[PDB]
């Protein structure tokens with residue numbers, strides 16, 4: 001029942017963390033890794049996580065997300081996310097960096113607008129677990145960001161940690177709701 | 184919430200009328216949220232009535248201080264410090280209502296570095312019983328002044344996000360306290 005990963009989960013994710021969630025830090029950057037257990041099939045979770053054009057399905061504070069007219073989801077495509085965690089609303093342009101449907105890995109970079117200066121980059125991976133009868137999922141999300149050059153010069157990285165956590169909670173809630181409509 | 188059942192709805196009609204209904208003033212906007220909680224209403228009330236400890240059930244609070252003499256009576260104030268990353272650093276709030284017999288509390292934001300002018304919130308706590316089970320519904324509503332008519336949706340969107348999140352945290356915290364009190 002503790003939300004923290006078990007030793008078995010942790011062992012099973014080591015290779016994934018090494019491959020996908022380990023960053024080469026530039027001086028004056030930092031990185032963080034979050035995990036969320038989800039009681040729903042990993043295919044269902046991944047179908048949510050992979051939709052680069054619809055982050056608002058599991059993320060908080062999103063006013064809108066717009067993509068190109070005829071949107072084809074591929075590495076290098078961009079989206080504009082308007083967030084209302086700032087008043088007035090801020091626009092960030094994000095690039096899709098990784099999409100592997102076989103291995104269930106996606107990731108993005110903030111390349112313009114608000115927080116461009118941060119060099120924010122994030123990776124999310126979805127993992128299958130099975131024991132006894134039961135199948136469940138663990139999502140890992142990590143990011144790397146520049147540290148602010150100040151004593152409180154918009155040092156917003158605690159807010160980044162906090163919002164990654166809440167977003168993973170929203171993903172769990174949404175995905176678990178959907179799986180109970182399956183049968 | 185996840186959503187009020189038809190039964191809950193009808194039982195709450197009077198409370199909704201008395202505490203959670205607003206006159207359709209232009210340049211103001213209002214919203215009502217509900218949250219089901221699987222814990223005793225006395226326990227939920229004991230958390231929500233603590234004007235000097237909003238951080239027990241609210242997200243985004245770094246700290247809160249009250250006067251050096253604090254008696255919690257209507258008209259008292261608290262100085263809430265917010266984590267960085269949000270439209271505000273601080274908020275000064277005044278207790279409007281505290282009714283221990285009816286389980287109703289409310290507050291108004293009166294100062295601070297932020298964007299929520301004339302924000303006023305009311306929270307009411309409700310007992311439900313069906314068969315051999317007790318649960319709580321919490322209702323929270325607010326009214327606030329909009330910057331403009333087009334930027335009204337953003338203010339409502341922001342405040343709705345925080346209120347929904349804080350009610351979710353209230354549910355998780357009350358549910359966790361109820362377990363640990365038993366065993």
Ligand SMILES: CC1=CC(=O)CC(C)(C)[C@@]1(O)/C=C/C(C)=C\C(=O)O
Pocket residue numbers: 241242243263265269270271272273274292297298299304341342345346349
């Ligand atoms: C989290 C936060 C960010 C802001 O920018 C405004 C303010 C500082 C007031 C606030 O505490 C907002 C609190 C809200 C909406 C509701 C509450 O507290 O019941």
